[PDB]
Motif scaffolding. Structure first.
Motif, PDB file in Angstrom:
ATOM      1  N   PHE B 134       0.825  -1.201   0.000  1.00  0.00           N
ATOM      2  CA  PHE B 134       0.000   0.000   0.000  1.00  0.00           C
ATOM      3  C   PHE B 134       0.862   1.254   0.000  1.00  0.00           C
ATOM      4  O   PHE B 134       0.703   2.129  -0.862  1.00  0.00           O
ATOM      5  N   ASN B 135       1.780   1.362   0.966  1.00  0.00           N
ATOM      6  CA  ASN B 135       2.582   2.577   1.086  1.00  0.00           C
ATOM      7  C   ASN B 135       3.427   2.811  -0.156  1.00  0.00           C
ATOM      8  O   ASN B 135       3.690   3.965  -0.518  1.00  0.00           O
ATOM      9  N   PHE B 137       2.464   2.068  -3.290  1.00  0.00           N
ATOM     10  CA  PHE B 137       1.633   2.544  -4.394  1.00  0.00           C
ATOM     11  C   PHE B 137       0.639   3.637  -4.004  1.00  0.00           C
ATOM     12  O   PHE B 137      -0.063   4.151  -4.885  1.00  0.00           O
ATOM     13  N   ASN B 138       0.565   4.002  -2.723  1.00  0.00           N
ATOM     14  CA  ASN B 138      -0.395   4.984  -2.223  1.00  0.00           C
ATOM     15  C   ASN B 138      -0.360   6.270  -3.035  1.00  0.00           C
ATOM     16  O   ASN B 138       0.657   6.976  -3.064  1.00  0.00           O
ATOM     17  N   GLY B 139      -1.486   6.583  -3.676  1.00  0.00           N
ATOM     18  CA  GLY B 139      -1.606   7.812  -4.433  1.00  0.00           C
ATOM     19  C   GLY B 139      -0.844   7.855  -5.736  1.00  0.00           C
ATOM     20  O   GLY B 139      -0.801   8.912  -6.373  1.00  0.00           O
ATOM     21  N   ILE B 141      -1.066   5.110  -8.215  1.00  0.00           N
ATOM     22  CA  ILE B 141      -1.744   4.307  -9.231  1.00  0.00           C
ATOM     23  C   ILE B 141      -3.240   4.547  -9.094  1.00  0.00           C
ATOM     24  O   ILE B 141      -3.716   4.976  -8.030  1.00  0.00           O
ATOM     25  N   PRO B 142      -4.010   4.323 -10.168  1.00  0.00           N
ATOM     26  CA  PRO B 142      -5.468   4.514 -10.052  1.00  0.00           C
ATOM     27  C   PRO B 142      -6.145   3.446  -9.214  1.00  0.00           C
ATOM     28  O   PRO B 142      -7.114   3.742  -8.502  1.00  0.00           O
ATOM     29  N   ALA B 143      -5.657   2.209  -9.280  1.00  0.00           N
ATOM     30  CA  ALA B 143      -6.220   1.094  -8.529  1.00  0.00           C
ATOM     31  C   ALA B 143      -5.197  -0.029  -8.481  1.00  0.00           C
ATOM     32  O   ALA B 143      -4.397  -0.195  -9.405  1.00  0.00           O
ATOM     33  N   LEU B 144      -5.236  -0.803  -7.401  1.00  0.00           N
ATOM     34  CA  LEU B 144      -4.407  -1.998  -7.309  1.00  0.00           C
ATOM     35  C   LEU B 144      -5.082  -3.137  -8.059  1.00  0.00           C
ATOM     36  O   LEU B 144      -6.296  -3.334  -7.945  1.00  0.00           O
ATOM     37  N   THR B 145      -4.302  -3.859  -8.858  1.00  0.00           N
ATOM     38  CA  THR B 145      -4.766  -5.005  -9.623  1.00  0.00           C
ATOM     39  C   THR B 145      -4.095  -6.279  -9.118  1.00  0.00           C
ATOM     40  O   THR B 145      -3.072  -6.231  -8.425  1.00  0.00           O
ATOM     41  N   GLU B 146      -4.680  -7.425  -9.484  1.00  0.00           N
ATOM     42  CA  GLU B 146      -4.077  -8.713  -9.144  1.00  0.00           C
ATOM     43  C   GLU B 146      -2.672  -8.866  -9.717  1.00  0.00           C
ATOM     44  O   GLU B 146      -1.803  -9.459  -9.070  1.00  0.00           O
ATOM     45  N   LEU B 149      -0.255  -6.775  -7.526  1.00  0.00           N
ATOM     46  CA  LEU B 149      -0.103  -7.442  -6.238  1.00  0.00           C
ATOM     47  C   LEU B 149       0.781  -8.676  -6.368  1.00  0.00           C
ATOM     48  O   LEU B 149       1.717  -8.875  -5.583  1.00  0.00           O
TER      49      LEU B 149
END
Lengths: 210, 217
Positions: B134-135, B137-139, B141-146, B149
């Protein structure tokens, strides 16, 4: 003062083959057994009984298998909701709407004053769980903290004990994210064959670990 | 039809009590045993042998215990690194930097062309792993994807088989994030007592299992 128990139900097909009955009749026996098991957990002083209803992968089974399973678990809630506190969580967007609507009504209708909680997790998958948490907080906090993560995990507290009957030694997408100190117990007995004594010796094993 | 294997080492304190030897000597036997186990895993055709070196909680032990353990694990890599591909991952900021420097040098010196990989995961803890991703990619990327991850998890692929000797039937901080259907095997034998026969019987058990991945065949 929380003490909790999580059950990974398993063995319904093998039980139908063993008994020479339909998968529907086996899942009906599962409904009965889960009501029993819920009562056992309550008598044993557990504050929440977690049941891992489904993984994301489970919803790629046939529509008939999904309907049979979801109706059997929901029927557990239909029978028990008036006398306990019911809650649920998980990857709710993969649960068919019929079950979510009924389960939400049952949750709202349940006895919120009860000191015992039956909690269903549906659509379990660590990947989906983490992705949802990220997308919720993305760009909105300076950093993710353990407190926030714990407050948004599918299982809202650490699991003390986890039991998986049916002979499979694996988590099958049902692992509780925030339970680093959970004790696990596996046994070959199919869920529908579990007796109160089987449950009790499982608890002896789990509780006696030094 | 390629498979990988993960080992959760356990039992060094109890083994030192059993043999009437120092903790240092028990970890020396662990080093020997892990070299053996790596060779066994290679002979059995596993593409990667993952070893769960440490949890985050392990680093709240005394500085002497941390040094003893980390040196014993690193010594495995010192002995075998020349003939395999070595890699590592985890919550690296809780690992004392000395071991990170040495393990990085060993990784650079290892055979990246080898068809066998030894992979250390250090500072395992799902909470720390998720917080780190999280930290990162925070702010940003538009969304986390599989895919993202999967590309950033400590363990870079799903684990097929995992073995935990030492009698504890639990995963502690060691459950692999992206392994929803990993097969688990527990045995009471202490790691330092495990023989090739113990390993082989574990493999009979693991390889005989019907893997369903949540579906109905």
């Amino acid at each position: 003062m929380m003490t909790n128990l999580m059950l990974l139900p398993d063995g319904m097909r093998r039980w139908s083959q063993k008994q020479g009955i339909s998968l529907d009749d086996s899942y009906a026996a599962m409904t009965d057994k889960l009501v029993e098991f819920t009562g056992w957990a309550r008598e044993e002083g557990f504050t929440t009984f977690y049941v891992t209803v489904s993984s994301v992968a489970n919803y790629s089974r046939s529509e008939e298998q999904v309907t049979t399973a979801m109706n059997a678990f929901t029927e557990v809630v239909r029978r028990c909701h008036d006398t306990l506190n019911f809650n649920y969580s998980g990857t709710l967007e993969v649960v068919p709407e019929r079950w979510l609507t009924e389960l939400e009504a049952l949750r709202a209708k349940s006895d919120s004053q009860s000191d015992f909680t039956l909690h269903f997790i549906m659509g379990m998958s660590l990947a989906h769980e983490v992705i949802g948490i990220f997308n919720k907080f993305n760009g909105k906090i300076p950093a993710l903290t353990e407190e926030l993560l714990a407050a948004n995990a599918y299982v809202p507290e650490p699991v003390d004990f986890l039991i998986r009957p049916g002979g499979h030694v694996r988590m099958s997408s049902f692992y509780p994210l925030m339970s680093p100190f959970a004790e696990m117990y596996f046994c070959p007995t199919l869920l529908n064959d579990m007796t109160r004594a089987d449950f009790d010796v499982a608890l002896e094993d789990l509780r006696e670990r030094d």
